[PDB]
Ligand binder design. Sequence first.
Ligand code: HEM
Ligand code: B9L
Length: 396
Amino acid sequence: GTPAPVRYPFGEAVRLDLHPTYAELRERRTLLRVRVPHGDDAWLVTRHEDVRTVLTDPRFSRAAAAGRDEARLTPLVIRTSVMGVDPPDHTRLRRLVATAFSRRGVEHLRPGITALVRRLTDDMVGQGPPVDLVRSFVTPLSGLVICDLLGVPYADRSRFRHWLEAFFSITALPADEVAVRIEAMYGYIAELVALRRAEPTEDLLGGLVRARDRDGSCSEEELVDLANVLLLAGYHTTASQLASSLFVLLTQPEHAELLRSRPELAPRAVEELLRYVPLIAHVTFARYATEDVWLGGTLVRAGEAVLPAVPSANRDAEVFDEPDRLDLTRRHNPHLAFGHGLHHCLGASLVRVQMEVALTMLLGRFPDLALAAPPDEVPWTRGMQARSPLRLPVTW
Ligand code: HEM
Ligand SMILES: CN[C@@H](Cc1ccccc1)C(=O)N[C@H](CO)Cc1c[nH]c2ccccc12
């Protein structure tokens, strides 16, 4: 007899604020049996120590969820490519993109990103306040970076960024509208992969089709999934953390000017903005136990699902000194904004480089940068999986 399931999500995720139950649950050292919009009931994992465990312990599988009605907040189960398989499939698939995303491999992109940010703030200079930082800086920057690396025509952004938001939708779209766009995009990706047989390219997608076509290293659906997720995670998720990180600094401007006055702080400010800012609206993808695991006062049984509350982990007072204060100068930062262990975020370095350069130049070229509106009147996405302001008007 397991306890009565509580309704999760606890409520809408509002701006960057965290529901109070997360902190109560950490203090309790128990998991919470929850009942979610779709799929299985789960245990919600809130403590940094335990989200570490569920995210990478081998007794918690992420392929298991494919044989189940997966505990989730979206009406349709999303196909997560390398995010939804175990070894040996995860090792096979991740090997194909490991080096292009490495620290050394991403650093060779630093010129181009920097040239792209200069150009992006060149226009702002000429055009003058007010500016929506989202439409004029954040979306181009993460949109062009990922589209150049991956070979996806950024001229096509008018079409596919309609569909992109069907993968992120909790309550913003009906289940039939969700399924319609999801195939619209797979068709689009599947067509891109076709042209790369006709006419190979020198981008990351061009080599993935070579890898299937002459090494037989993946399935055609695994190739389309890997390609989808790499565009999903770079277009929207990168933009939302940067948008969100911009909204923080501009509402706590003594940190902006601290980072302004000390640019050598940039790698620290980037790690802290990944931790402080709750990008994940509620939880990350669920894991099913494959044998019996005891944690959070619970003997979680084989076949039962856990939901890792990454943003709660990152406020854990037993890991982070003063966890709900923004300390850009924090030196050691074992956060989980990029997950933990086996599925640790492939694009970790590309997000660091983008952020580092973007904050550094935005704050450098515009020493007067301030919001052009009351922070409470900045609008935020409603009913989506990643939290982001929809508009960031600034003046200088
Ligand atoms: C601010 C931007 C981003 C954030 C906050 C973020 C966050 C995360 C998190 C938390 C996970 C682990 C999920 C889990 O274990 O439940 C993850 C995994 C992953 N991320 Fe990201 N991500 C970002 C950008 C990107 C980009 C730009 C790419 C690639 C272009 C990317 C590709 C991936 C992939 C492929 C995985 C799965 C890795 C694996 O299964 O081995 N992400 N990310
Ligand atoms: C419970 N997934 C949520 C929360 C989340 C989890 C991880 C990162 C960001 C956000 C989500 O927004 N997932 C989004 C929308 O489904 C897509 C996504 C983000 N990172 C991915 C990595 C691989 C495949 C898909 C994604």
